[PDB]
Structures are given as structure tokens and as C-alpha cells.
Amino acid sequence: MQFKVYTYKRESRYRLFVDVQSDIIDTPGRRMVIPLASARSDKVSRELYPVVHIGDEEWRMMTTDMASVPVSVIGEEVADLSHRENDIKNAINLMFWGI
Amino acid sequence: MQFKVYTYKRESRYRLFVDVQSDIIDTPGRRMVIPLASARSDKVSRELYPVVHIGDEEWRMMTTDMASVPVSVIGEEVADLSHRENDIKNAINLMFWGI
Ligand SMILES: [Cl-]
Ligand SMILES: [Cl-]
Ligand SMILES: [Cl-]
Ligand SMILES: [Cl-]
């Protein structure tokens, strides 16, 4: 579901992803997601890589590592980032349409 | 480069991808791309999966298989789809923001 955060059931580069696909766009067995990296370089653009807060820690939304995942790898839902829809939307639009 | 079509140097599900990343968005060593599938089911949405023409054949832009690729896998440039920027933009925006 769009803006919900999930763990990977199978080991990936990162440990969390946010679903960014529209809830009325149907891809049977898959969803478009952006991985979240532990925020641990400060000067990297916050416009393209928003900082979000999950499990009492900072994470960078790795916008340029966007990829589809099969539902078979989608594990527990850990959080909802719908309150950050404005920065998520700004980041996604910047990556394709910037300047 | 945005809207340019390339072959994969290493075997992938598909054989072509279109660069969809802005030319002023810098991801050292990588680019955001959408694979092209040989068009060979007709009733699949042309709004979400545009039909394009390369090497005298029809291809579907596999919008929901969007992923980053390392420059190391980017082979020969085979075509330019900049003339289809309107349908490509419509498809990408539909996948995130549809309804
Ligand atoms: Cl991490
Ligand atoms: Cl947050
Ligand atoms: Cl194919
Ligand atoms: Cl075309």
C-alpha cells in the first residue's frame, strides 16, 4: 500500500522499503518501492533523498534505487510515511523531471 | 542520457531499456531506466505501458519494471525515444499518482 514501509523477507542491500506505487495501479504479484538506508554524508540533497524517522532512528529514502519487488519478498509492515507524502512526491518528481 | 535506448551488456529479463532519469540529476555510476519488452496481450493499458517502434518492431515500455542499472551494464545506444516524451511522462506519472 502506497507510503507504507515494509521489511524484506529475503536479504537485500537495505532492510526497509516504502511502497510508492498508486493504490489504483494494479501490478499482480509486484509493487514499485524505494529502499530506506540508515542515514549514517550530511550534505547529500535532502530534496532528492528525504530524511525520515522509523524505530527511533534516521533513514534516507534512496530515491535513485527505486525498483519493483515481488509480493513474495514483502514482509511485516513496520511504519506509515503518508505524513511525508509532500517530500516523497517532490523527490520522485525531481529524479525524472528535475530542471 | 534521458530518453536514449541502450542494450544490456549482461543478460537481463529484457534486451533494451530507456534512460528516464533527468540529465541534471547526478547518480555517479548509475541511471534510472525502464526496460522495453517485445510487444508480443493487446488489451494491456497503452497509457501505463506505451507502445514504441525500434528496429522495425513494436516494444512495450515496462513502466512497472523501472530500476537503476550500473553504467558497467550500459551497452550500445540503439535509439532515441525523446519524440515519445509525452507518453513516457504520462506513464511514469500514472504509476505513482494515478487517480
Ligand atoms: Cl542500511
Ligand atoms: Cl518522518
Ligand atoms: Cl522481450
Ligand atoms: Cl515510437
Numbering used by the authors:
A (entry chain A), B (entry chain A): 1 to 40, 43 to 101
Please give sentences taken from the publication describing this entry.
The primary experimental system utilised is a 101-residue homo-dimeric protein, CcdB (Controller of Cell Death protein B), which is a part of the toxin-antitoxin (CcdB-CcdA) module involved in the maintenance of F-plasmid in Escherichia coli. To understand the structural basis of stabilization, crystal structures of three CcdB suppressor mutants, namely, S12G, V46L and S60E, were solved. The structures of the S12G, V46L and S60E mutants of CcdB were solved to resolutions of 1.63 Å, 1.35 Å and 1.93 Å respectively.
In the present study, we selected three such suppressor substitutions, Y8D, V46L and S60E with ΔTm˃3°C. The suppressors Y8D, V46L and the suppressor S60E were ~3 kcal/mol and ~4 kcal/mol respectively more stable than the WT. For S60E also, the major deviation is in the starred loop region A39-V46. E60 is involved in a series of salt-bridge interactions with R48, H55 and R62. There is a change in the orientation of the mobile R48 side chain resulting in salt bridge interactions with E60. The S60E mutation has resulted in reduced B-factor differences between the side chain and main chain in many regions, including R48, resulting in overall stabilisation of the structure. The average B-factors of the S60E structure are also lower than the WT with the most reductions in the loops 8–14 and 39–46.
